[PDB]
């Protein structure tokens, strides 16, 4: 069995009667999930996986694009020199777990090695016909509704010395975030101060451990800070909830100066800058009522500041980032890879 990238197909637990858009797309593009999913282990054998050059990430990317294309239709869309006007009805939008499976003659290799940084050899290796249930959550800064690491916090980067390589963080304890909108564009999220400082404490120390172990970059203390620039989609924690686009200020989350919870002032926008293509999409005004989303902060997207020449200092600054939704997919597709029989 040799490595290959074939033509995967999707499978989900979507319902035929559901009006929600993820269920509607998955009903016509996918199949019913495996009632008894087999996972045959492969003992006395090891093999290497690479999450950063995985074609499974690219397939999930363009599927979520076509999902967003036919689901969240904007009123006016500006792409290139063309203006695309279309109907923009208010829809119900909530992601569901999606499984990716290998066609006839192929299989998927799953690595069950605990504390796996994304690359290198794997002792625990099993074969599955499908992945696990992955919610295609499109978020920024904070990875929501993802999977948790069984051991400590795991730090993933294709090259930790490259400051352009975004660092994908995967938490071990979920940080519950409660966003709500009772100005019909003013919302706010609430997050417990105790659990966020505790998780931040464990993430800072894990960043220090992985840089002291695998990198020649040495620093005494780890420090966070708000992003230095960019569009509002990445300078804030941007996500989708009930069809509306939320832009939440995370300055309080990444403020070093540290009572119950932490309140993040949000803002719903009608004009967003799309992630699936280059252009802006104008959506309809928000719907009335109490719009509430309770999600799990399961991961972080961070970039490291450029080092000073001939300097190191006791402090290294990390900042939340986002934009490329491929990193959101490989935060779950890291353990899987396609094999050919």
């Amino acid at each position, epitope marked *: 069995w040799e490595d290959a990238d074939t033509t995967l197909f999707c499978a989900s637990d979507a319902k035929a009667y559901s009006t929600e858009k993820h269920n509607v797309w998955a009903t016509h593009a996918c199949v019913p999930t495996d009632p008894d999913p087999q996972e045959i282990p492969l003992e006395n054998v090891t093999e290497n996986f690479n999450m950063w050059k995985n074609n499974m990430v690219e397939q999930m990317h363009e599927d979520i694009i076509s999902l967003w294309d036919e689901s969240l239709k904007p009123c006016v869309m500006l792409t290139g020199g063309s203006t695309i006007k279309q109907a923009c009805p208010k829809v119900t939008f909530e992601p569901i777990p999606i499984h990716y499976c290998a066609p006839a003659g192929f299989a998927i290799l799953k690595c069950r090695d605990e504390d796996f940084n994304g690359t290198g050899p794997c002792k625990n290796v099993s074969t599955v016909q499908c992945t696990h249930g992955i919610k295609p959550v499109v978020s920024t800064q904070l990875l929501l509704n993802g999977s948790l690491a069984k051991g400590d916090i795991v730090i993933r980067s294709e090259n930790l010395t490259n400051n352009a390589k975004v660092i994908i963080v995967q938490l071990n304890e979920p940080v519950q975030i409660v966003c709500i909108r009772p100005d019909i564009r003013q919302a706010h999220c609430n997050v417990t101060r105790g659990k966020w400082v505790n998780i931040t404490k464990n993430v800072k120390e894990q960043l220090w451990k992985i840089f002291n172990k695998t990198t020649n970059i040495t620093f005494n203390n780890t420090i966070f800070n708000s992003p230095a620039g960019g569009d509002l989609e990445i300078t804030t924690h941007s996500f989708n909830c009930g069809g509306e686009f939320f832009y939440c200020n995370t300055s309080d989350l990444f403020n070093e100066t540290n009572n119950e919870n932490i309140t993040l002032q949000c803002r719903i926008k009608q004009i967003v800058r799309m992630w699936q293509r280059v252009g802006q999409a104008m959506y309809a005004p928000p719907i009335a009522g109490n719009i509430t989303c309770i999600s799990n902060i399961t991961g972080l997207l961070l970039t490291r500041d450029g080092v000073n020449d001939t300097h190191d200092k006791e402090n290294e600054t990390f900042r939340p980032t986002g*934009g490329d939704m491929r990193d959101n997919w490989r935060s779950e597709l890291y353990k899987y890879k396609v094999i050919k029989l």
Partner: antibody
Amino acid sequence: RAHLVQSGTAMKKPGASVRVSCQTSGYTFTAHILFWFRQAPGRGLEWVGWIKPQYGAVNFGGGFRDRVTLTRDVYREIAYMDIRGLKPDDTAVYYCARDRSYGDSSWALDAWGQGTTVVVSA
Amino acid sequence: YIHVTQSPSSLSVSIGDRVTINCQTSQGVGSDLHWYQHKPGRAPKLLIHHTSSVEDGVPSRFSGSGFHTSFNLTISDLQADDIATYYCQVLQFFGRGSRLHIKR
């Protein structure tokens, strides 16, 4: 195919500000990181910062974060570099360069702007 | 921080000679090493990317080599157009350069 054109030379006084533009053409603008390098007279090239033109995510080398602003215009496919609080030590030739990899960061700069001379003198 | 050291600083060359300059790194690099040609009054030009992969448009005489902490740029048959400075780069760390002039 990929072409990067910058702005002309800049005459500045110590403490003033300078804007250098970088017009791109012939390639997908938002799919290649734009780097900014400067070369002081008699010294080597030094990195000051890059920008990912998709959403404008930026990073800087040590020291430049305090007074350099990297921006871009996605519609017109043009990047900008703003430097405030100019010192005489900032007299150098500034380059904007394009990463060769599509949607990746290899630091291999294949397309270069012609350069912009900035001289900070009293 | 990664130190980049090039040698020699300046080298005497004759038309048609086999030239080889060295690039050194303070730590294990591996492969993502890039070489550039720089003539006065113009922008630097990418010659080799990733140790040995030659960029499109570069003449066949150029060739890169090396591993870990030592890398070499090689010109098989030098011509008049090849008289310039040559940098080696890794991440944001450029080398100070190796200058080439005609020997008489």
